[PDB]
Amino acid sequence: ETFKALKEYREGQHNDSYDEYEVNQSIYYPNGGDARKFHSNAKPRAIQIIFSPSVNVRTIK
Amino acid sequence: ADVAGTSNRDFRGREQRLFNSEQYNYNNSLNGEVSVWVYAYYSDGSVLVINKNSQYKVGISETFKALKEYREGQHNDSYDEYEVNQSIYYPNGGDARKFHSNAKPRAIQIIFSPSVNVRTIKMAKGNAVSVPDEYLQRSHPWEATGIKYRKIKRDGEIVGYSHYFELPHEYNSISLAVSGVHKNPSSYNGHNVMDVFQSCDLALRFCNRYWAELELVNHYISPNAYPYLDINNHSYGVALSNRQ
Amino acid sequence: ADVAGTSNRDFRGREQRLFNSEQYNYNNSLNGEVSVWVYAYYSDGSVLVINKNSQYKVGISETFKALKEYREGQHNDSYDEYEVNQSIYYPNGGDARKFHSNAKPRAIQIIFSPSVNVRTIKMAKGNAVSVPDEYLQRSHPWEATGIKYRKIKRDGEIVGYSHYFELPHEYNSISLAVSGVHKNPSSYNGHNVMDVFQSCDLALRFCNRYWAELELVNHYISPNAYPYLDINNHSYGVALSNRQ
Amino acid sequence: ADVAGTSNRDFRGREQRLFNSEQYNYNNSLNGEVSVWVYAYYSDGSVLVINKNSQYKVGISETFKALKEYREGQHNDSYDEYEVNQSIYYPNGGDARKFHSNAKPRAIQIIFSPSVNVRTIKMAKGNAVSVPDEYLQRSHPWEATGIKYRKIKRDGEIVGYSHYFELPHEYNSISLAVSGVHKNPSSYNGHNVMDVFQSCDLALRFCNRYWAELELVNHYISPNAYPYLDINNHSYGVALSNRQ
Numbered sequence A: 001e002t003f004k005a006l007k008e009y010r011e012g013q014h015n016d017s018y019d020e021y022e023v024n025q026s027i028y029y030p031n032g033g034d035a036r037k038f039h040s041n042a043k044p045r046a047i048q049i050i051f052s053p054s055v056n057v058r059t060i061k
Numbered sequence B, C, D: 001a002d003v004a005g006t007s008n009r010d011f012r013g014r015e016q017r018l019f020n021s022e023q024y025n026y027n028n029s030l031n032g033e034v035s036v037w038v039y040a041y042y043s044d045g046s047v048l049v050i051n052k053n054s055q056y057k058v059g060i061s062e063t064f065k066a067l068k069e070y071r072e073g074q075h076n077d078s079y080d081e082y083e084v085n086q087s088i089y090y091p092n093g094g095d096a097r098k099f100h101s102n103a104k105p106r107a108i109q110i111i112f113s114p115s116v117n118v119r120t121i122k123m124a125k126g127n128a129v130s131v132p133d134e135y136l137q138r139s140h141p142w143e144a145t146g147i148k149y150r151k152i153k154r155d156g157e158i159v160g161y162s163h164y165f166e167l168p169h170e171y172n173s174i175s176l177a178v179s180g181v182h183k184n185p186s187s188y189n190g191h192n193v194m195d196v197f198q199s200c201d202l203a204l205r206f207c208n209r210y211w212a213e214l215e216l217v218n219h220y221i222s223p224n225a226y227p228y229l230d231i232n233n234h235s236y237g238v239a240l241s242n243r244q
């Protein structure tokens, strides 16, 4: 997944979609955007990766 | 004339040092201001400041709702946020579409001017329904929290006092009031009581939401010679006593 | 040990009874809270509550406009309701599309905690332009209405005081303030004056609109051990003095 | 020590030159990346970039619709543009309110990293319904277009490969896929097959629309040390082999 694809998307609600385009421009390059917030709350705070017990853990990349 | 910076006749130097000393001392006289600020820090990096400035004594009192982030001229999920408040006031009391409202403060910083007497500071940190300590019947209406205030210092001078507490847990849902009294090392209290009543009317209030701590430092703290302490524990303010 | 509920050595029983007695008595000490609530009842069944909790004395003061129903995150006929206010402030002063605004309160209930002294209660029930009694020149700024307060009782104990008045007529358009003083049966008034000034800053306020009296009972009154009297004249609250 | 820039003992100089040589050579090893970019240029001056970066082999495949301009958070004539697509898929198949959609790309540039083997590049430039060559029955599924790729050069070094084609005519309505294989001058192909399958999962993708070629140069190409060729035939990239 892309950076954008991992950001929070609320189906059928407001998502600050224009401001969030500008947030992405600032994340891609420092001061590259014109957003109205310092930190987008759509950014993930953490990631958990889980595999089934049928994976071989030495092959995970 | 004498040459600058070489004798006791640099009157421009002496006057500069007196001007600064007079500002520091005037603020500390009973004719001077005492000021309080409450900073509420939000997860999007924005900061709400409330300031009050008054003679004699000063304070701020806000509801749980009033401390939540409000973005002027933008969407605020206003209906969902009514339902969020109902769930905060009473477990499962609401019908909201989110587990945690990002409009809840993540932290609070209380700052006083250096003219406060720290031993007079009192705080009522209530629950989300504005009760200081679980139930009204068992609540003392404040805690005297001056011992926890850290000195904000610049060049060795106290420029203000800070008490900072995080609200990082889901259960940290508060209403808040704070109060301090201007220094008064004299034994003049009395004759002055209606003047203190007028000070309640004369106190000036300011509130605004800044988009980032950087912007708060640059456009609010610094231009007004206010004291501040940032997330990196850096102190801001202007030392004045006996200084050019 | 002795068997429970059979001797003077049931210390768990004695401690439970002291815990409750201490809460009732602490509230009544000068270290304790005094609290007031104004309930404004709307025709859609919803209720606005405003509460203030403070040491020494407490009150609430609201405009005519501020008492009208406001539905957060929904439509409120906001423009028509500006015009409704102009017609209420002065006959035929507005251009509204309704004869009666359903946002007007149908009734008000004022409740005080049992720590108030009922003889100190004062009310300013003003007209829609915030004048107590027709014209300012002839207005005493309050009425002392304690005689009209009914005791809210549970198990024989006073858990609070209620004054209720309906606003069923088209001309019942009010602004409202109310105030009471915490009990003080001592002759200690003085030395304490700046503390009372800090209490004005420290008072915690709460306001919210509940959708029904049932919801107000279940999610506001009961969880907080508050006193209440419902439309059926049923009393709510928790008796504490000398009780397990 | 020896003086800088005067002897074979300038180890800081030697290490700088090795650092750069190692980056150029590592990219070319089978442990290194191979990368492709598709730039779609729109009449408002904006550019969509799609990039994919993977080990061993890499490619991009997009529909006609997916290559049309999309302005995030703005109006996009979305309904009319559905009807535009129906007319492009089949003559007179739609009911649109415009002759030419300005969301259609005016041109495409395909760039590969210098780690690709140009003889392995393949392109499927399909019609608007995703057929390579008129009808499926007569379609070879790609063309090997490496001969048309121009070397992007800086300071004499190949920093990347470009194939550019304009779509200036009304009938230029395409779907597009492109693929290249990382250099492999060895005879090690096999044992590695499941690793190549994992590379299909591990490939990282990026897409974004920049407002102008200038902004694409400044904020996308240059900060990431990517190769590029602009409309004025100017080359961008960083030469690394044996260079300080």
Ligand SMILES: Nc1ncnc2c1ncn2[C@@H]1O[C@H](COP(=O)(O)OP(=O)(O)OP(=O)(O)O)[C@@H](O)[C@H]1O
Pocket: B153, B154, B155, B156, B157, B235
């Ligand atoms: N190198 C030094 N030696 C002696 N005194 C100094 C030196 N640097 C500053 N001072 C003086 O020492 C006092 C304290 O200044 P200092 O800058 O340490 O305080 P601050 O700004 O409150 O704290 P900090 O600088 O640690 O954040 C001031 O009177 C100042 O003029």
Ligand SMILES: Nc1ncnc2c1ncn2[C@@H]1O[C@H](COP(=O)(O)OP(=O)(O)OP(=O)(O)O)[C@@H](O)[C@H]1O
Pocket: C153, C154, C155, C156, C157, C235
């Ligand atoms: N059947 C009874 N006989 C004697 N005393 C009782 C009886 N029931 C309750 N009491 C006691 O009498 C006192 C008054 O209790 P009661 O329940 O009447 O008051 P309340 O709840 O204020 O009023 P009400 O119940 O009429 O609304 C309390 O001390 C209680 O423990």
Ligand SMILES: Nc1ncnc2c1ncn2[C@@H]1O[C@H](COP(=O)(O)OP(=O)(O)OP(=O)(O)O)[C@@H](O)[C@H]1O
Pocket: D153, D154, D155, D156, D157, D235
């Ligand atoms: N005046 C010169 N005489 C000899 N060699 C030069 C001169 N200027 C640059 N070079 C060297 O010649 C090689 C080619 O550099 P050059 O700048 O021509 O290539 P480029 O940047 O790919 O092409 P261009 O500059 O024409 O766009 C490099 O090794 C460079 O260091």
Ligand SMILES: Nc1ccn([C@@H]2O[C@H](COP(=O)(O)OP(=O)(O)OP(=O)(O)O)[C@@H](O)[C@H]2O)c(=O)n1
Pocket: A013, A014, A015, A016, A017, A018, A019, A020, A022, A034, A035, A036, B075, D073
């Ligand atoms: N940095 C920004 C952010 C927003 N806006 C403007 O404010 C309007 C509303 O902002 P947007 O970010 O699109 O939020 P919403 O419309 O609330 O949410 P959504 O688009 O997800 O429905 C937009 O038309 C946009 O032009 C802007 O000029 N500059």
Ligand SMILES: Nc1ccn([C@@H]2O[C@H](COP(=O)(O)OP(=O)(O)OP(=O)(O)O)[C@@H](O)[C@H]2O)c(=O)n1
Pocket: A014, B074, B075, B076, B077, B078, B079, B080, B081, B083, B095, B096, B097, C073
């Ligand atoms: N728990 C919720 C939250 C929202 N909604 C509905 O979704 C609509 C939009 O939600 P709202 O919370 O009002 O957000 P916005 O309109 O985006 O923002 P604002 O009201 O601040 O402009 C509202 O009409 C509301 O009825 C709902 O039914 N139940």
Ligand SMILES: Nc1ccn([C@@H]2O[C@H](COP(=O)(O)OP(=O)(O)OP(=O)(O)O)[C@@H](O)[C@H]2O)c(=O)n1
Pocket: C074, C075, C076, C077, C078, C079, C080, C081, C083, C095, C096, C097
């Ligand atoms: N006496 C009135 C009442 C309403 N209107 C018009 O009708 C429109 C909608 O009325 P309003 O009273 O604002 O109601 P809503 O938009 O439904 O509700 P809200 O404003 O609370 O969202 C307004 O633009 C207003 O100009 C008017 O001309 N004269």
Ligand SMILES: Nc1ccn([C@@H]2O[C@H](COP(=O)(O)OP(=O)(O)OP(=O)(O)O)[C@@H](O)[C@H]2O)c(=O)n1
Pocket: D074, D075, D076, D077, D078, D079, D080, D081, D083, D095, D096, D097
């Ligand atoms: N060939 C077309 C094009 C547009 N419309 C109508 O015009 C309205 C607006 O057009 P649309 O193409 O959706 O543009 P916008 O709403 O401006 O942009 P977007 O949908 O991207 O926000 C639509 O409801 C659509 O039904 C139509 O009937 N026939």
Ligand SMILES: [Cl-]
Pocket: B029, B030, B031
């Ligand atoms: Cl003084």
Ligand SMILES: [Cl-]
Pocket: C029, C030, C031
């Ligand atoms: Cl006492």
Ligand SMILES: [Cl-]
Pocket: D029, D030, D031
């Ligand atoms: Cl290798």
Ligand SMILES: [Mg+2]
Pocket: A012
């Ligand atoms: Mg919708």
Ligand SMILES: [Mg+2]
Pocket: B073
């Ligand atoms: Mg607007």
Ligand SMILES: [Mg+2]
Pocket: B154, B155, B156
């Ligand atoms: Mg210093």
Ligand SMILES: [Mg+2]
Pocket: B078, B079, C073
């Ligand atoms: Mg809404």
Ligand SMILES: [Mg+2]
Pocket: C154, C155, C156
């Ligand atoms: Mg009973």
Ligand SMILES: [Mg+2]
Pocket: A017, A018, D073
């Ligand atoms: Mg929008």
